[PDB]
Amino acid sequence: MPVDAWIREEVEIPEGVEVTVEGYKVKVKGPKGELEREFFWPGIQIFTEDGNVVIYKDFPRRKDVAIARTFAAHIRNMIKGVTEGFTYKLKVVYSHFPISVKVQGDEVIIENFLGEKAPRKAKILPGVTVKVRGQEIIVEGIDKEAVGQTAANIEQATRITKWDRRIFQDGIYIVEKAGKPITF
RNA sequence: GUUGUCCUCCCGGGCAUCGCCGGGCAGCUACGCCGCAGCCGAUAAGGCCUGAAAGCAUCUAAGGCCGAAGCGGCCCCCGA
Numbered sequence A: 001m002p003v004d005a006w007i008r009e010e011v012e013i014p015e016g017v018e019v020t021v022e023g024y025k026v027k028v029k030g031p032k033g034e035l036e037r038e039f040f041w042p043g044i045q046i047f048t049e050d051g052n053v054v055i056y057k058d059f060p061r062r063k064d065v066a067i068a069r070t071f072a073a074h075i076r077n078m079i080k081g082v083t084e085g086f087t088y089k090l091k092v093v094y095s096h097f098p099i100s101v102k103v104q105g106d107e108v109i110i111e112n113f114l115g116e117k118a119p120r121k122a123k124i125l126p127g128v129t130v131k132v133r134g135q136e137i138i139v140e141g142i143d144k145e146a147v148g149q150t151a152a153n154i155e156q157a158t159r160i161t162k163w164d165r166r167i168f169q170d171g172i173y174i175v176e177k178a179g180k181p182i183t184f
Numbered sequence B: 001g002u003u004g005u006c007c008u009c010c011c012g013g014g015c016a017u018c019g020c021c022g023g024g025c026a027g028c029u030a031c032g033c034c035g036c037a038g039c040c041g042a043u044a045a046g047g048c049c050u051g052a053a054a055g056c057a058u059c060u061a062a063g064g065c066c067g068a069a070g071c072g073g074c075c076c077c078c079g080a
Helices: A062-083 A144-157
Strands: A008-012 A018-022 A025-029 A034-038 A045-049 A052-056 A086-093 A100-104 A107-111 A120-123 A128-133 A136-141 A171-174
Touching (some): A018 A045, A025 A062, A034 A062, A052 A062, A086 A144, A136 A144, A144 A171
Antiparallel strands (some): A008 A052, A018 A025, A045 A052, A086 A136, A086 A171, A107 A120, A128 A136
């Protein structure tokens, strides 16, 4: 339990990002689009003190601090989302089969995965754009949360655990999020 | 059709408690035929995102995406 009487943390907001508050509900608009969330937790008020956004509750308890810093981090993902957006780059890697990745409409379709005759599909969200260039594909969009979800829906579609996991590695995987994951 | 017998014979009948045997309509039956799904919602086990506590990491701590023949719906039966 960290103990302060304010307890108060402060979010630095650029000139590029304007934040508007209406209770516990946050909208963040910059030079490109807008994004809304509801921050829900008891007793945590978000309001704007000048150029600065403040997230506060009177009482310090351990639960609260965690939730408070997550909200700070959601703001921060909006500040670099609404400015210029988020890019995660992904690779489709195949063990045996030229594996055809195309966007047909508001779903991405992956065909010819493991010699399958059937289509695989995975959902794309209304703020996210999927571009395929060769067997690199880059998922691109206004929001990190959203971008992160779309990418992982693609991966969860190709999922394989019904055979050995060392000698079938067919699928599209996360080469990049925003750093490079990972070394074993 | 036929064995026994009674009606004198002929024909046409009775009983032998379907007389025995052969065939069979209607009906009822099978050993016969006809018909008996998919899909959506919300979840579990599980897989993940963001994402802190614990400046990182992390599928959960809050929020979010999927995901059982099971659950609800769909269907079928009854039902002022």
